[PDB]
Amino acid sequence: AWTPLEPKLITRLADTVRTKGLRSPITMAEVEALMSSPLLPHDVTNLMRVILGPAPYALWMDAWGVQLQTVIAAATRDPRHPANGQGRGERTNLNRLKGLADGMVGNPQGQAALLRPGELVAITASALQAFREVARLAE
Amino acid sequence: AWTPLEPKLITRLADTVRTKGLRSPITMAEVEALMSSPLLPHDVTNLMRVILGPAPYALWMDAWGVQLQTVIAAATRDPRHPANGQGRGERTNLNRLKGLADGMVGNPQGQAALLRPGELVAITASALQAFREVARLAEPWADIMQGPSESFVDFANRLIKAVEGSDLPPSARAPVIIDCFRQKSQPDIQQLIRTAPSTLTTPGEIIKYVLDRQKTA
Amino acid sequence: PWADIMQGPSESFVDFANRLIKAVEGSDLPPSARAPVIIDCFRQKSQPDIQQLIRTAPSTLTTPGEIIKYVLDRQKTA
Amino acid sequence: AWTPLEPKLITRLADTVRTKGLRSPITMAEVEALMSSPLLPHDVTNLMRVILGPAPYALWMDAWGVQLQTVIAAATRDPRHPANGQGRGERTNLNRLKGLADGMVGNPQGQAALLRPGELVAITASALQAFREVARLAEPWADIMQGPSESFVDFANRLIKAVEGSDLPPSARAPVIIDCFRQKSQPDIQQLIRTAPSTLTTPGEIIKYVLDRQKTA
Amino acid sequence: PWADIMQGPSESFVDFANRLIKAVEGSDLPPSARAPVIIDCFRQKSQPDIQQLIRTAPSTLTTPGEIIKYVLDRQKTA
Amino acid sequence: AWTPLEPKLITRLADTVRTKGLRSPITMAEVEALMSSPLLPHDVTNLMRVILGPAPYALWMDAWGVQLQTVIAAATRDPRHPANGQGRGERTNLNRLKGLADGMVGNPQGQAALLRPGELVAITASALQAFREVARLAE
Amino acid sequence: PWADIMQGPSESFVDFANRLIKAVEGSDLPPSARAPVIIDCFRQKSQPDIQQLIRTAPSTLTTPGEIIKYVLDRQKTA
Amino acid sequence: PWADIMQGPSESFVDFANRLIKAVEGSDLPPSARAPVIIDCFRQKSQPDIQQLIRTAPSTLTTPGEIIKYVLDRQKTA
């Protein structure tokens, strides 16, 4: 069952990003805090939509896609990925990682249903690395 | 059994709407948050009464009625609506959707008793769409120019804000943002983007390139 | 007093509408007489530019929300 | 049996391209006309040699090769191509499409002998798309303003021309034209469109309304 | 003669409309041709301020009474 | 079998419209000339795309749609329309008149296959009336 | 003579490319030596603004058509 | 000391590059840290004309030799 993040925490994090900036160690610590439980693509996408401005959000979408592509290359380079399965029918496509696959587009409940925990942690680590890249790039 | 929403959350949401406005993405996220569980007409009505001013509340009542009427037209166009039933005796009238039917007027307990979960989710989605309409209505991208003294990140922020908070379809924002970066953004940056040895096909990539090769001054 | 409310020369229209709806709903009128009074106060107050904007409405506006939407659409940006 | 195109039609088309340019809708219509029957690689090659200058001809050769390569990739991605056959011995190589295969180099009769009708129509569609690309490349909407002394029909003509002859998708031209009518078109017409008692949802309707209620001067 | 009627530089609009409607209805035109003629005479006579006022009508005026009402509403008080 | 109109005649008509205008009696006579044989929606659409500028073309699309809608109202008001049939399965929808129906979008050959001669003459008369309206409106 | 062709200070690039390709293809060179000569003449003629524009090409341009397309995209509008 | 090397107002760029590469390679840095340091010293030293010339590089320069070639191509002849 999907539970959304508190809008109070999200508002506090957005104001933190607004006053301290993207690169302060306190901001990265707060992001790591709100990045503790494995989030669904819907959660991370809406979180970055709210806390980041338009141009940093575009940059972050780009960087997140690139990092997820690196993850999928490593996944096709190793059939023992915690997102993959043993047979070929469990291979994870980027539509399933970005939340674009069938039964997931716009629906967080179905998303949480079909996604694997390894998928969730890989998406989360990818999003964190992308946030770091964009923060280092913006300023 | 009906449980009311916390007045603390409602007060925080009202102050959010008061400071950030109706159209900010944080405000829409907060509304989506408080719009998570299917609400009864009483809940949504009181919520909009508290968070919205008088005139936005009138506009929202209008828009909610229109959206509910579209829903009821789709319902009479398909007898398999999750609010409808199979026989004709379960057809859902607008008095039952707006909470005006018998046994519901002013009583949230009876409301929660007689209403269907499909009814609740349809009412909730209708109210969310009406809120979006009123927010877009209560408060121009093609008139945005980069000032002679303005930096590029401020211009990009302003332009992306005005383009995403406009009436364009979602699939037409990126090309418009790119073509506005190319034609606005005074001729130094125009020539900087023009003479790009690589092809830039995303606003983020254009922003990164310009920030790298910009004339430090 | 609702019948003394005018839209100031420099005031925006949403502020005037907020003030007027507040004073009309927080008054001694019956509940069934607030909407017609709000409409007829939008038409006679709300300084003559918006008065003419509401007068020359190709559609018939029969609700304060519809009048507010129409005026916000076609208002003179300034 | 191969029949050449009339040099009279080719001369008329060449003069059309010379006076109107590569991108005019009349020129594209004339090209579509002379692109009606499926042409052999010899025909299209000589046609583009005659109607196009040297540099546009080089560009067109490049673009035609790229489009034919995309076609051959789709062909190896589907063994049911009207140019392909069922067995592997009918697979169509680019030497057969560009007319470079054995028994075809320089000979249009042998070309017409060995080529398939699906091959011909694929070559023809590829050449048409390549011509469109080169025409769009050989010769900005968001920078168009209505001059202080310019009439409104001239401004509308210029704007619609620049918007339709641009890189936008076909489904994004009407909203862009409308929103450019509203934000460009100096503030007298801006206020004239703003105070429209009816909702104008088409460039033609906006043009008609403005032409009716415009300030005669 | 109806086709020689012009709105004087100092004349009000209701006097001009009265004179024009009088001369058009008391003439040799068929009954089914009076309203279009009165409208098209309002549009081409009625000195260029009112001409532009009628031209820039967001609504379509299809009756002499409607044109008279619109002009009386939005006329330049002087 | 579909045969296109000569680009030479179309070029001459376009230059006629360019020099004489839309409303001259010679221009209307030339349009009536090129409107002699019943044209398919593809033909009339491309013809108006070539001879008319962008804004007159938008106006003409609007007017053509309105006139075709009046025709379809008269058609549902009389089951004996030369475009209609006797049974209800031959009723003509606006997607079939504007060339938007199935098997017709972008293909003039299939268009000529499925269309009726009554359909063609109704489309042609509608387009002529729309051209007259737009010409009277433009100047 | 192809080796004497320079892009004038006021001449556009498409005219220069047309003139150069004409003079190179209508000359005594073998057919297999025209494209490299056209490329190397684009690079050394075509006054230093376009020279630097071609020099700083992140991609490798190996055809006169590709060079023409690149230059037409990134040229200094003036 | 490498971190004290600046390009003089009148000094050419090849002399500055020679001096900087000499002082960086003949220093106490590890071998794997010389190229990034040379690049970042080209970018921050090398007086603001060449600084802006390197900044506005449509391509990404990831080697001291490539930076030197680019600057020598597009340098202001004087």
From Swiss-Prot, chains B, D:
Range covered out of full length: 249 to 468 of 701
Signal sequence segment: none
Site (Involved in capsid protein dimerization upon acidification) residue list: D167, D179
Localization (cell): Virion
Species of provenance: Rous sarcoma virus subgroup C (strain Prague) (RSV-Pr-C)
Record-given protein name: Capsid protein p27, alternate cleaved 1
Domain of life (superkingdom): Viruses
Ranges in a coiled coil: none
Organism phylogeny: Viruses, Riboviria, Pararnavirae, Artverviricota, Revtraviricetes
Primary role: Self-associates to form the irregular polyhedron core composed of hexamers and pentamers, that encapsulates the genomic RNA-nucleocapsid complex. Assembles as a tube in vitro. Binds to inositol hexakisphosphate (IP6), which allows the assembly of the polyhedral capsid.
